[PDB]
Amino acid sequence: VLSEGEWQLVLHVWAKVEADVAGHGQDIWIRLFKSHPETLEKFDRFKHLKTEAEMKASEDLKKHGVTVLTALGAILKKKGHHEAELKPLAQSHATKHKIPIKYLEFISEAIIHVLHSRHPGNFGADAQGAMNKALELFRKDIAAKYKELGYQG
Numbered sequence: 001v002l003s004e005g006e007w008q009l010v011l012h013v014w015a016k017v018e019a020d021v022a023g024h025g026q027d028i029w030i031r032l033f034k035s036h037p038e039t040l041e042k043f044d045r046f047k048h049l050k051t052e053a054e055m056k057a058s059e060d061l062k063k064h065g066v067t068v069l070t071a072l073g074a075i076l077k078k079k080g081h082h083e084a085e086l087k088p089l090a091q092s093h094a095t096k097h098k099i100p101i102k103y104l105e106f107i108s109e110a111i112i113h114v115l116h117s118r119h120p121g122n123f124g125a126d127a128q129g130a131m132n133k134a135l136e137l138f139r140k141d142i143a144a145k146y147k148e149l150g151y152q153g
């Protein structure tokens with residue numbers, strides 16, 4: 001469980017992210033796909049992108065980034081009360097997409113890296129600690145659901 005103070009640090013930097021969701025979405029995707037190329041193989045819709053240049057030019061990838069960050073933003077705003085939001089997300093990623101927990105760790109690392117680069121003033125050590133805790137909470141809960149749904153992860 002996070003304290004209200006930790007949630008405040010998380011929502012304060014997220015408010016900056018919301019000033020440009022599409023842009024943050026792109027940086028995160030490109031960071032992830034370059035650092036862990038294996039994750040790209042999970043998207044039959046994007047697996048054909050070969051360079052950073054092609055990724056940045058993809059309108060579909062941009063749109064998808066917005067969908068993903070909007071869903072994550074909805075979860076963070078719940079401040080730990082996200083049971084309802086996690087069920088459909090867990091079912092699709094465990095049953096249809098088959099995304100192991102390891103990949104959720106990779107995208108978590110990408111989010112922290114992008115926020116550190118674009119918002120140093122609102123992402124000091126304490127804020128990063130709060131965001132890491134919020135993302136670990138998210139992963140822990142998704143993992144528990146995975147098990148209940150019959151997927152190891």
Ligand code: HEM
Pocket residue numbers: 039040042043044045067068071072088089092093097099103104107
């Ligand atoms: C921050 C964590 C994540 C969130 C909040 C999230 C959210 C979403 C949402 C909302 C969708 C569309 C609706 C749905 O299918 O449920 C989606 C689709 C998908 N996600 Fe995620 N996702 C996350 C992480 C990942 C990761 C790490 C991978 C793979 C390495 C992944 C793979 C997929 C795939 C393959 C689709 C289908 C894309 C398509 O063909 O249109 N997701 N995700």
